[PDB]
Design a protein around this ligand. Sequence first.
Ligand SMILES: CCCCCCCCCCCCCCCCCC(=O)OC[C@H](COP(=O)([O-])OCC(O)COP(=O)([O-])OC[C@@H](COC(=O)CCCCCCCCCCCCCCCCC)OC(=O)CCCCCCCCCCCCCCCCC)OC(=O)CCCCCCCCCCCCCCCCC
Ligand SMILES: *P(=O)(O)OCC(C)(C)[C@H](O)C(=O)NCCC(=O)NCCSC(=O)CCCCCCCCCCCCC
Lengths: 99, 459, 178, 128, 87, 54, 174, 52, 69
Amino acid sequence: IRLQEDPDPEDENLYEKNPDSHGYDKDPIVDLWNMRVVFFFGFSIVLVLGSTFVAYLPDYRMQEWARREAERLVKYREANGLPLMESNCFDPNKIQLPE
Amino acid sequence: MLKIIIPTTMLLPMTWMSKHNMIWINATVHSLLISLISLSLLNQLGENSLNFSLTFFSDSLSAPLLVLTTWLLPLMLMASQSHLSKETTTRKKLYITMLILLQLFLIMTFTATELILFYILFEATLVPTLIIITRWGNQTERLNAGLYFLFYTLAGSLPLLVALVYIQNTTGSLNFLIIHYWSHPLSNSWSNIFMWLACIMAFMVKMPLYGLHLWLPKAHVEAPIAGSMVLAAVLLKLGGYGMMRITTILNPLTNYMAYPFLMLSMWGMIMTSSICLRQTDLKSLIAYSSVSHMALVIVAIMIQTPWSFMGATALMIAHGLTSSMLFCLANTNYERVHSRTMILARGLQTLLPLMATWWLVASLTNLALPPSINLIGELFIITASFSWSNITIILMGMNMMITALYSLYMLITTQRGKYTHHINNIKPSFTRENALMALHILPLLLLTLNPKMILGPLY
Amino acid sequence: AFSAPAAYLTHQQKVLRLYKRALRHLESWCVHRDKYRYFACLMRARFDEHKNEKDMVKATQLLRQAEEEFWYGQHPQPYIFPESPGGTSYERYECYKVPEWCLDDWHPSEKAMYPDYFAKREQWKRLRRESWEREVKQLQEETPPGGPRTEALPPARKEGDLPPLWWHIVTRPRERPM
Amino acid sequence: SFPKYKPSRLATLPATLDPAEYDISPETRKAQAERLAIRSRLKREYLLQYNDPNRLGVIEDPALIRWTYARSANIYPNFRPTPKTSLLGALFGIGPLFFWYYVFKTDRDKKEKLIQEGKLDQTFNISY
Amino acid sequence: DAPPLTLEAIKDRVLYVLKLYDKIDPEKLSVNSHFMKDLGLDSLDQVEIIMAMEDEFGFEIPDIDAEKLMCPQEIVDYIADKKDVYE
Amino acid sequence: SSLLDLIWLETILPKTTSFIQMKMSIMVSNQKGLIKLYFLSFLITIMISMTLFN
Amino acid sequence: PDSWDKDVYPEPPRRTPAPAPQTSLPNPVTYLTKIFDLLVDRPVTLAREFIEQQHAKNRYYYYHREFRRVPDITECEEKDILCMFEAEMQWRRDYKVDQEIVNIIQERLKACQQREGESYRQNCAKELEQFTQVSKAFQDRYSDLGAHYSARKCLAKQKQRMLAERKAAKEAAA
Amino acid sequence: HVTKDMFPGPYPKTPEERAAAAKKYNMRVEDYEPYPDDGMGYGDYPKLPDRS
Amino acid sequence: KRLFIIKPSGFYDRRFLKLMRFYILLTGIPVAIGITLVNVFIGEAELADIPEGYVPEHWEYFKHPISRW
Ligand SMILES: CCCCCCCCCCCCCCCCCC(=O)OC[C@H](COP(=O)([O-])OCC(O)COP(=O)([O-])OC[C@@H](COC(=O)CCCCCCCCCCCCCCCCC)OC(=O)CCCCCCCCCCCCCCCCC)OC(=O)CCCCCCCCCCCCCCCCC
Ligand SMILES: *P(=O)(O)OCC(C)(C)[C@H](O)C(=O)NCCC(=O)NCCSC(=O)CCCCCCCCCCCCC
């Protein structure tokens, strides 16, 4: 031997001392409460409440507003015979081309 | 963003003042609460971003990454508490402090509004990761892995710093809004070519790009479980976010300078999938799968079309979740048998059924299985690449075939077959491990249910 | 499977294995029982014709020619018993085989569901633990100084002893475990 | 006589057709005995460890450890730049890259020429 | 599904096949009769007997183990051990 | 895996750089600590600075 | 139904042929339709009536947000950040509205194809022309702007198109 | 438990090195044969028959 | 004759599944009941023109009651 080294320790099994162990801590009470807080907070709170919050987030992307505006524009344009989509985004009168 | 930044800086003293047996409980509970608070950033506008103040802003691209980071912190806490049972109280608190500092730096990086602050923070993320790897790694190669990771990132990113200060001197501002509104075309000159190279190469090394990726297998194999989870889930997404941010000022030079990177990305995607086909180590297989997916993201960003950006963002989120779940499963297998060899342990389906179910789900999400967000992102990228050119479909099909091949090869080798006779220390799966897998997999399916939240600003 | 192999196969063993393989492939060719009986009698007639030969070189040459003829004339799809390695029912129940070490990790309630079985299991475990030292002593006493020259194991030479290395052979899972 | 069987790498030669299987030197018998002795010694060691009742865990396999180490961590120290390795590396690493570059560049040049000449069917192409 | 085998059933079936063998005299055939020492057979006859037993019971006996079965009782014991029959 | 990832991608960027830095480090640090030698070096530097810089 | 506008979402008048049986055999389809109406339609109608009665007791309203027009990028001066911001926001809103217009036209096309069925190639030629015109205009507007599109890029593209048209007209007149 | 002497090493160039390598891999000296030293990184790992 | 079937411990997997179901349904069921009650009684808003001189709020610009809240 070249050192005064400890031998490699044996692997410790949590089920030996605590057959109904959740694998969080060696202490049974702390292990049980760690399982309880993780499950409750994570699953219940985060998953369920965040999912319903995201589901019912207000339509700030203006999808339905854009649909209503498009409906009004289509109705007005096809009622008056105008093209449904104007070929230019900006006004050629307001655009000044070089000579 | 202060309502999310300050709770992390309060996580730090809480962890350092908590009892010796309550550190994990307190950290997990309050990390979950912070994630729930950060879920409120997903309410974005369709016109512009959320400008909180002069320093921080949130966008449709920044919000999913912030939510992913905040959700990822407690999972890393669970895995770390798995593998650090015998550590001393001070060292446990130091590990939790490193994780908290990494999360804080990542949040500030994603919310930063200037390119220089973004650079400072995304370089500051190196120190906690390097310390974690080189201090709590298991094998000898952790030191070499840390050196490779550090020097690859820094050699990539220093020219980015020089180019950023040059751009500020030239134009007047590094603010993202100003450089977006006041953008001017980048003429075809050698100086512009080298500026483009500096920025793109920094973020490509961060991606990583094929040929500049060996640090990724070295670090991911040799890092502890928390380091492996954070490195693949989030730290690989800094390059993609940066490239999606800086490409505003690099046009139209990107049309001419993207060919070598596109060829590298496609061919290296094929090559890394082939490498996955012949891997004797599970963590290495997962690492090279990560490289292939990030190469696909690089292709999407380089082709740079509105359909490619949405696919890139969706694929980044999906890959983060999937790679984190795969690393967790491999870590449980390793803790069972104390070795990373793939063929050492077999029959884990007849020895551990629920873990076999988790493996099946993770491998199904790893390959593009509809209607998962993985498939959504991959399909958008494939469509954009098809519009770009019509042989990219050949390359993408080859990659998909090899991806399915190696994913199912890993699943069959680890789970199916007959159990190894001499391995009799495989105890039943823990409630902690099962909860970890469930919390990895359920958000992915919920994001599949609601997909517009991870498609970025181009949606 | 249960018998330790030798260093080599003798000429008699080689010719007997060739005979059995040829008969099996002939039965594969000759589907009907009477036709198979006729041609199997002819095959054994050939073997009996060449049974008596004093020249071992000529016998080896005949064996080589017979092996080449068999390889040319073999059935591409020979009949295989369902449980044989090539069979359609091979390794079907390997997923249902669970070991006793996996059995002992049960919860106390699960163990209490089978009270009588686990008492006998504990008796078997005590019997195993009370014999290992004698087994290893017997194994190390009877081995040659150079090392084991074959995979055969000795039996129990004493009234109160068990054959060395018996636990897994005795407690291997049943062929139809579930 | 009967047509001969030609073994290949993907269809190996059966043992019963191997010419060396019927020409046994006395040294071949002692070589087989030595192989059997090695196998028996390894089997004895493994069986002792396997049937030990006080053992809990995995019987570490030195052969498996050597295989895993040689496959990954032992490649570079034993690599030398030779003409064969240099040519193979250059080919397999660079040739595909330039091949794909040429293919994609040619396709995009043809497409751009068609666009400029205005004879490419791009109607209804709204998404890109 | 199939009814379980028993030691008596296995012994009866193997003796049935052996008595149906022509080269064996049924009267002098017992469960301990050696095929070559006191029945007067040879290697090919033993191989044919093993093949007949394989056809009878629907499973294959490997050549390494088949050569050592020189007794009807040995065949019964081998079949019972392989089929996990204890009664 | 072997030829590209473990051999040539290692040789080109990270291994060659480390080798060059190690060689240069050995060359720079291989000094015998002789005042005569590095004062003659100072003299050469002075001459070069005087002549080649104007 | 009054939920949508019949002009925006046209439907041709529905001509259902009258039943003219030619056999004494009972109609299983008629019998099953009567059973379905008795067992499902009446309960769901009663439930919906109860729900709508509950709704009418707490009737409240929501409005459609109105945006006024602002000066556009053509009027904005160079590097005038506030005017550029306003013009860019207005341009993005107009882009969203145009996308929804294209969506409406596509829905019309799909509905007409399904309704006509086996005679779609002839009876849907009217909706195909409108879709062709709308797609052409939308492509000319926002065809190749890229991921970082902006009102400035759209204006530059329009200027290029106008210059090309002027050059073509001059060449034709020459 | 494996020592540094039980790991694969460089290509064996002398009969003593080849004998040591054969002993290391639990093989006979006559049956041990390394891959040709072409610089491909095999080292002293034995070349076993290409069967399955 | 009934033979003992050797199986891996399923108690822990059953316990995890039961706990996960219980904690998901602990808040899922009240949320579902609340959503159903809101939809049945406090129905969605009806689109109306803005009265002249009236300035609504953003929640008054949104439709679903939960989104407005
Ligand atoms: C452990 C392993 C597993 C882990 C899983 C992963 C973890 C999951 C964590 C949780 C994730 C949650 C994510 C967020 C969800 C939030 C909820 C949400 O998004 O709701 C959206 C939305 C709800 O609507 P909304 O947007 O709130 O309101 C819009 C309307 O204004 C509303 O309409 P309305 O106001 O006119 O009336 C509707 C009202 C009232 O409805 C009625 O009244 C309907 C009446 C029907 C029968 C009527 C006729 C019969 C009458 C018989 C009696 C007649 C005589 C008496 C009559 C009365 C007295 C006169 O009903 C409702 O509002 C209830 C809707 C359902 C609520 C679900 C809440 C989920 C909360 C999240 C947690 C869930 C945890 C799981 C446990 C859940 C609980 C077990 O839709 C749904 O909830 C889904 C409805 C689906 C209906 C059927 C659709 C067709 C199905 C077949 C399709 C083709 C085949 C496909 C395959 C088969 C199907 C899969
Ligand atoms: P028991 O110990 O009595 O066994 C007697 C033996 C055979 C061992 C003798 O003692 C013995 O060794 N005799 C001399 C060696 C000898 O028998 N040589 C010749 C045997 S091979 C041969 O002559 C018969 C081969 C002919 C048939 C070949 C079958 C190939 C056709 C198969 C086609 C597949 C479908 C039908």
